[PDB]
Design a protein around this nucleic acid. Structure first.
Length: 218
RNA sequence: AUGGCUGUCGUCAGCUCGUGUUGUGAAAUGUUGGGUUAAGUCCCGCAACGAGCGCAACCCUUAUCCUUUGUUGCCAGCGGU
């Protein structure tokens, strides 16, 4: 709701002509996003995104670059929602089938880990198995309790996370992206011209989104 | 014309498949890349995710120690011989 405070746009380099409607674009070789265009765009994204959030849907924040972590873990986990913060595996939506059995192995190995037989029979293989929980835990972290493929997708950079956008367009999932002036509005259904790599901007930004996901009529 | 059995490349480290994706297609990817290994060995990365046959291990023997039993095998300590 609050006016974007401190980002005003970025990316002098590799700017994309399809971002030409969103650029004010003056200072010191770098491009300034027209935030007077961003505010209606971002309010629309909060509108439809709250609309699917009230229908009891799953949202899947996507935060692979740094420092979108742990800001996407903090914002998704502040809601009762899901996230990807480390490397987004190629095909966790379009073959979720195989990713379902990898999530199943993460559940079986944490149940085996903190409760069952973890000290049993070996030290070396037990260390092997625990670092399998680090690898499967940081890759399949947020999505491990989803149990479906989600009803929306909220990516924090459109060019850095083009794979996830490409799959959610492949599957008919609404993509909500904060694009920058280098990115491309591929199949992003609700584009938001913003700043992808400022931590102030993405914490303000995810703060608003996580605010409207759990917003409660009460 | 065959079965069964065998040699050989070669005990060389390779050969594939399902699902997915890319290509009009033959096909490609996976299996390539940075390291490493005896080894597609293992890690990391990655439009791939996994799986099979192979590699490794399980088998026999050899190298050390313990327990048991001690004949026909052995003789340290005992006695005479």
């Amino acid at each position: 709701m609050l006016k974007a405070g401190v980002h005003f746009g970025h990316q002098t380099r590799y700017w994309n002509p399809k971002m030409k409607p969103f650029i004010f674009g003056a200072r010191n070789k770098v491009h300034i996003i027209n935030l007077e265009k961003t505010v209606p765009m971002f309010n629309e994204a909060l509108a439809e995104l709250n609309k699917i959030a009230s229908r009891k849907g799953k949202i899947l924040f996507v935060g692979t670059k740094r420092a979108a972590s742990e800001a996407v873990k903090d914002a998704a986990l502040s809601c009762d929602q899901f996230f990807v913060n480390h490397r987004w595996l190629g095909g966790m939506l379009t073959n979720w089938k195989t990713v379902r059995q990898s999530i199943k192995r993460l559940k079986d190995l944490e149940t085996q880990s903190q409760d069952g037989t973890f000290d049993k029979l070996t030290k070396k293989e037990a260390l092997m198995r625990t670092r399998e929980l680090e690898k499967l835990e940081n890759s399949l972290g947020g999505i491990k309790d989803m149990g479906g493929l989600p009803d929306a997708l909220f990516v924090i950079d459109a060019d850095h996370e083009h794979i996830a956008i490409k799959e959610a367009n492949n599957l008919g999932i609404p993509v909500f992206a904060i694009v920058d002036t280098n990115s491309d509005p591929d199949g992003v259904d609700f584009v938001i011209p913003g700043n992808d790599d400022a931590i102030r901007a993405v914490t303000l930004y995810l703060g608003a989104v996580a605010a409207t996901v759990r917003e409660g009529r009460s």
